[PDB]
A paper describes a structure:
Similarly, recombinant [name] was reported to stimulate human monocytes by binding Hsp90 (26, 27). The structure of [name] 24–170 presents a small globular head region (residues 24 to 85) and a long trimeric coiled-coil motif made of canonical heptad repeats, plus the two novel undecad repeats.
We determined the crystal structure of [name] residues 24 to 170 using the molecular replacement approach and refined the structure to 2.45-Å resolution, with final Rwork and Rfree values of 20% and 22%. The asymmetric unit contained three copies of the polypeptide chain. Electron density maps revealed [name] residues 28 to 170. Within the head, [name] coordinates a chloride ion via the side chain of conserved residue N44, forming an N at the position d layer, similar to the observation about NadA5 (30). Two regions in [name] unexpectedly contain highly unusual 11-residue (undecad) repeat motifs wherein 11 amino acids form a coiled coil, deviating from the standard heptad repeat pattern. Intriguingly, the first undecad repeat spanning V97 to K107 presents an unusual d-e layer, previously identified in a few right-handed coiled coils and, to our knowledge, never detected before in undecads of left-handed coiled coils.
Numbering used by the authors:
A (entry chain B), B (entry chain C): 28 to 172
C (entry chain A): 28 to 174
Write the structure that this text describes.
């Protein structure tokens, strides 16, 4: 009967879909359904398993593992980014301390430059007044002879 | 008949696979198939739902949500990395401005050091010529008794 | 018979589940099962395909592609983070070189300030000893005048 065959194909088809969802291993019974509706009862070899889309894991196991990978990869990158941001924060505070110390260096350099200029002007005046006094003395001596 | 039984198992199995793909909720009819091929018509409890791999969501809904998570996690990290890189770009420009200001400080310090050395050489000569002149006058006075 | 119908529904249901796992395309036979258990043999249109959850790809193909996306996105971000960290490492070494050069500038500025102060102290003494000497000579001349 054609109803006997249809029930047989349906069992085999439901069985195979179940293995796609829940997986299979070497030795486990697998059914191959022909275009002619001919059902072949085989046993999954190491080849069938190794060269399967998910290597006999099944859709449920793969999706569960993928969910684990997605979350693990997010935790891992979130912590790498938090590390880099902390390094950036420490470089910012150090660069701010460097700029502050340079501003102090400039203020000290400017006070040193100004003191040098004042000393130079004070020496120039003193040298001019000394020259004038020595010249006056020489003239009093050059006259007294 | 064994064909009656086979059709019944096939319906129950196809129903069960459909729930794995499309999901189930508390109250919804669930079928438990025995190794003996005995089909039990139960009703999904809150336990069956809460302690299910995807909590009755089904493979389609989970994979759809996972695709949403993957893309959302990529947008989120891409923007955190773009933020960190902008902070790095601003630290680079500021450090380059700091090094430039320090190079100017060094040039100004070298000019101050050089002017200080020249001034020191200039007073040494003046001080030497003053000593010579005072000593000559002292001799002119010591002679004139 | 009710067993004839049950076998027919089961075939159609198993066929549909298979399409959800392995996918479909426009033209491919699709079965629509009624609540009444009435099976309708249709042909997937461009609408059925375009407005499907995974657009007829099937669960296997979507999960395989998603695995590719997850790994590609991890490789891509791992390299962007490795790039940023290398930039951070180079900024650290340059900032350390800047701080070292500033410490040298300060030491040189401190030596210049100290040499300026000593010079100012030496000129003051010389200037004081010169006034004393000119003043003594001026007195030796002023006395030698009052005769
Ligand atoms: Cl099925």
């Amino acid at each position: 009967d054609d109803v006997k065959k249809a029930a047989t194909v349906a069992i085999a088809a439901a069985y195979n879909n179940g293995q796609e969802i829940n997986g299979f291993k070497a030795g486990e019974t697998i059914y191959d359904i022909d275009e002619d509706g001919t059902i072949t009862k085989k046993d999954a070899t190491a080849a069938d398993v190794e060269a399967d889309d998910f290597k006999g894991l099944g859709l449920k196991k793969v999706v569960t593992n993928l969910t684990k990978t997605v979350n693990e990869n997010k935790q891992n990158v979130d912590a790498k980014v938090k590390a880099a941001e902390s390094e950036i924060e420490k470089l910012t505070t150090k660069l701010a301390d460097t700029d502050a110390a340079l501003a102090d260096t400039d203020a000290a350099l400017d006070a040193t430059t100004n003191a040098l200029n004042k000393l130079g002007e004070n020496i120039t005046t003193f040298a001019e007044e000394t020259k004038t006094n020595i010249v006056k003395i020489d003239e009093k001596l050059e006259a007294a002879s």
